[PDB]
Paper text:
Tailed double-stranded DNA (dsDNA) bacteriophages and their eukaryotic counterparts, such as herpesviruses, possess a dodecameric portal at a unique vertex of the capsid; this portal serves as a channel for DNA packaging during viral assembly and delivery. The portal interacts with multiple copies of a [name] (SP) to form a nucleation complex, which initiates the assembly of the major capsid protein (i.e., coat protein) and other minor proteins into a procapsid. The [name] procapsid consists of an icosahedral coat comprising 415 coat protein (gene product [gp] 5) subunits, a dodecameric ring comprising portal protein (gp1) subunits located at a unique capsid vertex, and an internal core comprising approximately 250–300 SP (gp8) subunits and 3 ejection proteins. In this study, we present the structure of the SP gp8 in complex with the dodecameric portal in the [name] procapsid at subnanometer resolution.
Three column-like structures, each interacting with two neighboring nodules, were observed on the GOF nodules. The nine nodules, which were essentially identical, were formed by α-helices, and each column was formed by a three-helix bundle. On each GOF, each column connecting two neighboring nodules consisted of a three-helix bundle. The three α-helices were contributed by the column domains of the inner base-associated gp8, the outer base-associated gp8 from the neighboring nodule, and the side nodule-associated gp8. These three SP subunits interacted through the three-helix bundle, forming an SP trimer. The gp8 subunits interacted with the neighboring portal subunits. Each trimer interacts with two neighboring portal subunits.
Numbering used by the authors:
A (entry chain C): 68 to 245
B (entry chain B): 70 to 245
C (entry chain A): 71 to 245
Amino acid sequence: IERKRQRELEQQMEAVKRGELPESLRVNPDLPPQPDINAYLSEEGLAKYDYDNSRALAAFNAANTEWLMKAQDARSNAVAEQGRKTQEFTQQSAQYVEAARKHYDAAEKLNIPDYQEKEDAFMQLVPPAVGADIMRLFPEKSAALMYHLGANPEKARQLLAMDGQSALIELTRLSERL
Amino acid sequence: RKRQRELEQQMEAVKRGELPESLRVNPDLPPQPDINAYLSEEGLAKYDYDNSRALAAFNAANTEWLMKAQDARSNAVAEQGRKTQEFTQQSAQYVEAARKHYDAAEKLNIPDYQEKEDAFMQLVPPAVGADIMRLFPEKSAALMYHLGANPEKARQLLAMDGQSALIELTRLSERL
Amino acid sequence: KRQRELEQQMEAVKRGELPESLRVNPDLPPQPDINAYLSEEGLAKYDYDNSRALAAFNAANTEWLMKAQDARSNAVAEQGRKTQEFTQQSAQYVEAARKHYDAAEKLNIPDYQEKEDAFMQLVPPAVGADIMRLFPEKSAALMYHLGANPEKARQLLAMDGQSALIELTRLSERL
């Protein structure tokens, strides 16, 4: 039951392990415009340069070069940037897979699967990112308080109105409770 | 005892830095037909014999080639970093293997396993010995002790493939 | 005391403070020009055919970007190689340093200090470290005898440094 959403997670991590990364993951380069050929090869430009192709193209070269060296510098910057992001999402995907696996193990030991569906419905209510936080920090910080979190949704939002680290402190203390 | 000291010496030599070449990832560069073929009969035919459509065609082709080639080799570099940190993890794991294996080797209360390990080195390459002491070093000492006792089983395991030979080594550890 | 600043400069290297000498510039071959080919003479080579000319344009841009990135990758590989190499030979220089020392204070000479100053003035720390690298067991002793023979030392310093090391080995065998 609850392991099905773990399988959805397995598909998002499959998008990473297979290399079939999401389109939004990839980042396009930001480049200065290519110099305009017709800005100089216009017949009006030819009259400017006495109907000579060679002289129009000297300016054309100036314009074009710098653009291509900037292109290669931006390509190096882009390989660095996008490789960094792909790596980081790789570690995030891993941490998610083992964290979710352990969390669903704990929920299975909790042996109340019919509560896990409403639990996760509450998570896609407004804590998707908070669910990711649960996964990354420690997936099972409060077992019976997870039931209560299902139970406490409003005062759940009350608790979530306050920031992440202090919320971690509150979750640790309520774990000391449950 | 000295085999330990050389093992770590080599291995913190590994940690403070050096890298082999295996981690390199070949970038992916997608080929593509050129604008000469695009103004050719086939290219113009697929663009309905329009030169301006071919102009848009090669401009889009360059832009998308930038897009996809960039994504390809940047993912290749990301995987290169992945395998580099994997190499770091393997180095740390082999450190643990060396330390615990040559710490537990003396717990047998006997020194005669040294020549048995030397016989294992002769029969079986030291790289495979490092691998096996990495996998499970708790019975490794008795493992090459008995292997030096019976080199015939060492040869018969060397004949067979590495993974199934490892499985049989695990069985030999078990029925001890 | 020279040993102490030997180590401080050694780990000064070890914090990545590599000299500019280790910065190796990758070679970028000249960029192809669109204007060598879409101009009057280039299209004359191309018989005024813009299709082939702009095809050469595209191919040149693609291959130039590819060779630029290849040069970058080669620069990365070689810079890593040189960095690791120089770290290693730094390790052997500091080796020669402290084995030279511990051997020297193992020996029971009365007048170590001033002769050590004189030769460290005469030979750079790297040169001395290489001296111990080639001859480690009694580099101190070759320094002692050279102080007992700095004249030749002079002839020596006058003559080739590598050949100076050759003559140092010669006299070390001679004693």
